[PDB]
C-alpha cells in the first residue's frame, strides 16, 4: 500500500499501523571519507534509540505499553481528538516542551519496576 | 608552546614550587620543576626591519 | 494450619519438648520455622529462627530442630521464668506466606 | 545466584585515540571539535587511583 | 533496643473503617520490611500482612485481602494499615512487627525480629 | 646546591629557545644559572630564519621576517634541570626533548576504559 | 544528582542504582580517519556487550537474574559483604579469574532453557 | 567442540545446538579507508537481522517459536526428514522461493498480536 512516510498525513491511530514501514529505513579519499561519515552516524542514531527504549523496558517492541501516568499539563486533550483528528506531526509540535520531562519519568519508573522484580525472585 | 630550559606560559603549582622525576636519584634523568608562582620575562627585537 | 493443641509440663531443671506439626507443602519443605514466647498481656519475643538458630539475646537453654513434618523445641535447664505460651510459625511459601499454630502453655512444676 | 548487570561503575588503564576540541592557525584550525561552554567534572568519593605521568600515552 | 509504638482507635462500628499506624526507632527503619500479626482476643497469631523495605511489594492474607491497605512511609518511620469494612471477626490486638521478608540482596529473614506492644480493635 | 649554566651542545639545546612575535629566538641563560645556593638580568639572544624543528633532519623551514619591532610579554612556569653528578650537587638547564614540555601539562590526566559488565552473587532465581 | 562514575567508590548495593548512569555514556584526510575509528571502534564494543547479554537470556535488561548457581569456590563470602562492604571496583579484581568459567555457564544454562520452551509449545 | 561452521554438514536438528558458535563470530589512508568500511559493513549486517527479528518479535532469541502456519507448498516434508535427514545448507536451497513471502507473514502476524496486547490492557 503506502510506502515510507506515506501515512504522515494520516491521523494518529490511522498511522501507528505502519510502524515498520519507517523503522526499515533507519537501518577521492575524502569523498570516501564523508560517506563513512555518513553511515556511522546512522548507526550511531539507531543505537542511541534503541538503549532509550532499552532502559524504558520497551526493547524489541514497537507499541510499548507503560505505566506512567499522563498529567494533563502536558496535554489537556481526550482520545478522540488526539488518535482520530490529529497527526503525528501536529502532536509532536503540542507537546514538544515536556518530551525530557515524560522521559525521565520512564526511566525512573523502569528503574523501580525492575528492582521490584528482582525482590520477588 | 614550544620551548627550551625554562617552560612559559604554562600551569602554575597550586601551593609549593615541586620538583618531579622519573628518578630522583638517577644523574641521566631530568627534573621537571614547576613553580607556584610566574617569573614575568620581557623579550624583545628592538630593530625597525622592513620587508620586501 | 500447624499444630500442637496440649499444655506442656515440667518442674524446675526438668527438659521439656513442644512439638509443631504441619504439611508437605509448608513446614516440610521450607526450612524456616520460627518460635515466639509470649506471656500473657506481652507482645510476643523470637526465640528461634530459621529452624536451630537463636537471636543474641536468647539464652541457650532454648534450641530446636525439625524432621519429616514436624518440628520442635527444646527448653532446658527450666526455670520458673518459662511460664509462657510458646508459638511456632513457618514460611509456607508465596501466596500464603505465614502461618502460625495455636500456642501451648508451659508449667512449670 | 548468579546476576548479571549491566552499566556497573568498572575501569581499567586503557590507550585509546584522543579527540582535540577548541573554543590562520598552525594546529588547530577547523579539524577540531567545539568545546563544551559548560564541561562537567564529577568528583569520586572514596576513589583512589594511581597515576604515573612518565608512562603517560 | 528498638521501640516500635502503634497508635490508633481501638473501637468501630462494622461496616466502617479504622486507622491504624506504628511509629518507629532506634533503627534504620528503611533497611526493614514490615508486617501486621493479629492476635484473636483469646486465640494465637494470625498474619495479616506485609510490606517491602521500600514500600512498593504489599502482600495479604486471603481475609482481608479486599479491604484493607498496608502502607510505607520511610521519611517519618511509619507504618499505617487502613481497614475498610470491618467485621466482627476483625476484633484483635493488632501487633506491629519488622521482619516477614527480605531485600534479596541481603540474607532473608522469613521470622519476625521485633514486636511493638499492639494496638486493640473492636468491631461492634 | 649549585646552579651551573648549561654544558655544550648544539644552539638548540644550551639555549633557550622559543617562538615569539613569529621569529625564532635563542637566548642565552648563563646568566640565570650562575649561583651557589641561591634592576634586572639582562640576557641577550640570536635570532635565526632558517629553522629545523624537533630533533628532524630534512625538513627545513625559513621563517619570513617579521616587519617592525617585536615586543614579548611572558610567564616562566617551571625548568627543565639536569644533575651533574660528594658534598655538592650541580645543576644545570636541559631540555631537547619536547615530551618534557607536555608531560608537564598532561601529569594530572589518566585515560581509563569503561567496562560495563558485571556479576555477583544475589538471593534470586530465574 | 551523581553523574558519570559517581558511584565508583561506593558500595556495590549503594551502586546499581545508577546503571543508567553509566550505559547511556557507552554511546586532513589521516586525521578524519582516526576519528572515524574511534566511533566505530565505540559502536563494536557496545554491541559485542549487547550480543553476549542476549545469549544468556539477559536482553533488554540491567538487572538479570538467571538459574546459575553460585560456586563458593569462586568468592566465599556473604551478601553482607559483597554488597554492604565492597565496591564494584574491588570485586572485579577478586573475581577476575573466575570470569570466562562463568560467562560460559551462563551461555550454557540458557541454551538448555531455550531448547525446554520449544518443547513446552 | 566444534568451533565456527562445525556443524554445517550435520543435519539440522543436530545443528541449531551450535547457535551460539556462528553468532559470536558477525560481531595509507587509502587502506584504513577500505578497512572502515569492511567495519561499517560488518556493523550494519548484523543491525540489518537484528531489526528483522524485533519487527517479527523474536528479540533477544537464537530460537523463536512463531504463530505463522507452514504451507505444504513452500515444503511437502515431514520432521522427519527436514530435522533428521536434511542439512541447513540443503534447506536453505530448497526453499530459497518462498524465503520473501515467509518473511512477509511473520511480520503480519507480529503486528496484528501486538495491537491485540494493546487491547487487552
Ligand atoms: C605567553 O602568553 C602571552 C599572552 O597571551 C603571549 O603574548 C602575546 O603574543 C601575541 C603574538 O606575539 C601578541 O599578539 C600581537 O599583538 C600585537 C599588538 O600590536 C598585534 O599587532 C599582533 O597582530 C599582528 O600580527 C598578527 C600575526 O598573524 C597578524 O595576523 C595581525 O593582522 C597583525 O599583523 C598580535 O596581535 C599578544 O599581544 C601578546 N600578548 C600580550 C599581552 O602582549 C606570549 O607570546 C606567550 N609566550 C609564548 C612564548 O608563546
Ligand atoms: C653566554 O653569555 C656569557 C656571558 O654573558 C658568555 O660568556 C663568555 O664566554 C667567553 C667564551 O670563551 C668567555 O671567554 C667569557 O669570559 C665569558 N664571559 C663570562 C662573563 O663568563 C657566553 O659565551 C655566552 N654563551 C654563548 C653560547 O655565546
Ligand atoms: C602570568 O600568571 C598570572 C598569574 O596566574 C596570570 O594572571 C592571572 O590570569 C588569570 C586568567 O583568568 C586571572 O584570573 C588572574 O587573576 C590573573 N592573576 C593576576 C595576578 O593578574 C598572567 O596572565 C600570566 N601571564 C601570562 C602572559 O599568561
Ligand atoms: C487525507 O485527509 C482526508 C480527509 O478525510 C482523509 O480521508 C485521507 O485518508 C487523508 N489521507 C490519508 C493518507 O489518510
Ligand atoms: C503534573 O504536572 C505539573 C506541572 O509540571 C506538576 O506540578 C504535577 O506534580 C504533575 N502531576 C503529578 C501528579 O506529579
Ligand atoms: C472530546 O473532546 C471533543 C472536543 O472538545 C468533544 O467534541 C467530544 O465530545 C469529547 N468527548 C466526548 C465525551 O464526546
Ligand atoms: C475531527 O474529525 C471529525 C470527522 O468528521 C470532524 O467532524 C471534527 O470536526 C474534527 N475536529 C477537529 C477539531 O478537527
Ligand atoms: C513551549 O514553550 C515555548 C516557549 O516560547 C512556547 O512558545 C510554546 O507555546 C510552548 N508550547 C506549549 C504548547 O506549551
Ligand atoms: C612520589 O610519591 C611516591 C609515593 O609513594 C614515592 O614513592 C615516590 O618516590 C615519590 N617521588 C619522588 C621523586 O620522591
Ligand atoms: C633509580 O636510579 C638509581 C641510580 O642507579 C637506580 O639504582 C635505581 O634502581 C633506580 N630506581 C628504580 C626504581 O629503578
Ligand atoms: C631591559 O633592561 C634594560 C636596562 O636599561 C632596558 O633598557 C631594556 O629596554 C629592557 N628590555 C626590555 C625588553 O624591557
Ligand atoms: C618603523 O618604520 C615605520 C615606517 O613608516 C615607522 O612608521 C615606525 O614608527 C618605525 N618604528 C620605529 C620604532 O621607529
Ligand atoms: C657556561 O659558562 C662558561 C663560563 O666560562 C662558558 O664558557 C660556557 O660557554 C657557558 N655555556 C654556554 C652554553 O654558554
Ligand atoms: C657568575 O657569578 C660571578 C660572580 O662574581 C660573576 O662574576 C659572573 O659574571 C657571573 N656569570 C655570568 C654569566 O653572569
Ligand atoms: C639571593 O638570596 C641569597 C640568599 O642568601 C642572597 O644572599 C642574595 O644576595 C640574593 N640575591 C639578590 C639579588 O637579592
Ligand atoms: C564514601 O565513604 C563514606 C564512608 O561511610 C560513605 O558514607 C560515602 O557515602 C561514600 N561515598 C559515596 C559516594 O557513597
Ligand atoms: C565449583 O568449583 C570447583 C572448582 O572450579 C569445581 O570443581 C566444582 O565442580 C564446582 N561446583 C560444581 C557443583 O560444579
Ligand atoms: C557475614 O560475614 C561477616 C564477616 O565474616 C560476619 O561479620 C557476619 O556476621 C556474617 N553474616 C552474619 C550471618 O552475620
Ligand atoms: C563493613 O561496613 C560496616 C559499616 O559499619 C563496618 O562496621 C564493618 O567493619 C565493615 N567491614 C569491613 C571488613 O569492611
Ligand atoms: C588469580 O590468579 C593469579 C595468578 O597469579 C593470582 O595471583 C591471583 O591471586 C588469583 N586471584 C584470586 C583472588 O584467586
Ligand atoms: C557426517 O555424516 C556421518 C554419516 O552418518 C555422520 O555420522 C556425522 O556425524 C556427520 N558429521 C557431523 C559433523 O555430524
Ligand atoms: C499456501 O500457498 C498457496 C500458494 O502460495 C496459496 O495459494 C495459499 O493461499 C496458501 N495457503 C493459505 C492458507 O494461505
Ligand atoms: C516421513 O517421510 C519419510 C520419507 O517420505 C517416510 O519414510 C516416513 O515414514 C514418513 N514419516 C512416517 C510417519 O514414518
Ligand atoms: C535419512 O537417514 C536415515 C538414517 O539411517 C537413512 O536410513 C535414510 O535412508 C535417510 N533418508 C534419506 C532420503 O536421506
Ligand atoms: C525456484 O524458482 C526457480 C526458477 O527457475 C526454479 O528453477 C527452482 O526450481 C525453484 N525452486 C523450488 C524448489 O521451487
Sequence with gaps: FLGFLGAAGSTMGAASMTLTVQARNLLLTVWGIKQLQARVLAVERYLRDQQLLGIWGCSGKLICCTNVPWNSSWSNRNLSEIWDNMTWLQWDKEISNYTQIIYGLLEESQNQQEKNEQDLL | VVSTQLLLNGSLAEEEVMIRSENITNNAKNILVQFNTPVQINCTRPNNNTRK | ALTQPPSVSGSPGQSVTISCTGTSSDIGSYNYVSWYQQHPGKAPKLMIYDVTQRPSGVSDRFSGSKSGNTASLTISGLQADDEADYYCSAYAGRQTFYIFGGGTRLTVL | ?57 | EVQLVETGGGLVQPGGSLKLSCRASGYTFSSFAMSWVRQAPGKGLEWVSLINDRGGLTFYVDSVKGRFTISRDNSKNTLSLQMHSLRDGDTAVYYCATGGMSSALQSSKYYFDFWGQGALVTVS | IRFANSSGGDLEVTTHSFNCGGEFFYCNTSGLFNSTWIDSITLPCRIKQIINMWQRIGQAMYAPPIQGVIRCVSNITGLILTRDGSTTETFRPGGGDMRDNWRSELYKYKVVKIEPLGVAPTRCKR
Design chain 4, 1 to 57: 545466584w548468579v546476576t548479571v548487570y549491566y552499566g556497573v561503575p568498572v575501569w581499567k588503564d586503557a590507550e585509546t585515540t584522543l579527540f582535540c576540541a577548541s573554543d590562520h592557525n598552525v594546529w588547530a584550525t577547523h579539524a577540531c571539535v567545539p568545546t563544551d561552554p559548560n564541561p562537567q567534572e564529577i568528583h569520586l568519593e572514596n576513589v583512589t587511583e594511581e597515576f604515573n605521568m612518565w608512562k603517560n600515552n
